């Protein structure tokens, strides 16, 4: 008098950085076949599956709702596995519990000093002053301005400023004669 289990069904759960920052609730409606009273008849049912997305959850976190798949007179319904996926964010890049802020600056700003207003996921803004030379690819850590660590959400990763230094398309001879005399060896 034995049954047997269908393989799990997977479904992506796309979640923005801000939602990873703070947590959120996601409601998934699943329409599935269920076995009636009589063990022979099958209805369509809807059921809401509620997923409390925890602060700082990393891509690939699995949230399994056991036996929520289609039922037969005979089977064990499949597990429904939700897999957490990052939504691309238009400004930040996610690096575990770190957040990368690409900051584009001219070669002027890179060599002469500049100031970078770092936005934070919760709305604040943190001005960071660079007096010294900034190199291509340079990183500058803004401590604790990242995401909660998911196992211990009191705790925070960092926001990293990562510079791309934009060079001009051309430099006219007149500039180059001037540049030559002032650029270090």
């Amino acid at each position: 008098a034995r049954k047997k289990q269908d393989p799990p069904v997977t479904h992506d759960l796309r979640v923005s950085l801000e939602e990873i920052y703070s947590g959120c609730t996601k409601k998934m409606k699943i329409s599935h076949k269920r076995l009636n009273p009589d063990g022979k008849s099958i209805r369509n049912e809807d059921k809401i599956l509620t997923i409390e997305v925890k602060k700082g959850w990393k891509e690939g976190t699995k949230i399994t709702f056991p036996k929520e798949g289609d039922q037969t007179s005979n089977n064990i319904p499949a597990d429904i596995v939700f897999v957490l996926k990052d939504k691309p964010h238009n400004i930040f890049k996610r690096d575990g519990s770190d957040v990368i802020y690409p900051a584009r600056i001219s070669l002027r700003e890179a060599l002469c000093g500049c100031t970078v207003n770092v936005p934070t996921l919760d709305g604040r803004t943190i001005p960071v002053v660079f007096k010294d030379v900034i190199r291509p690819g340079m990183r500058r850590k803004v401590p604790g301005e990242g995401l909660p660590l998911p196992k211990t959400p009191e705790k925070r990763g960092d926001l990293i400023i990562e510079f791309e230094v934009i060079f001009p398309e051309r430099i006219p001879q007149t500039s180059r004669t001037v540049l030559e005399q002032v650029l270090p060896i």
Partner: peptide
């Protein structure tokens, strides 16, 4: 198979 969609 079952159909799943997000709801508000």
């Amino acid at each position: 198979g079952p159909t799943i969609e997000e709801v508000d």
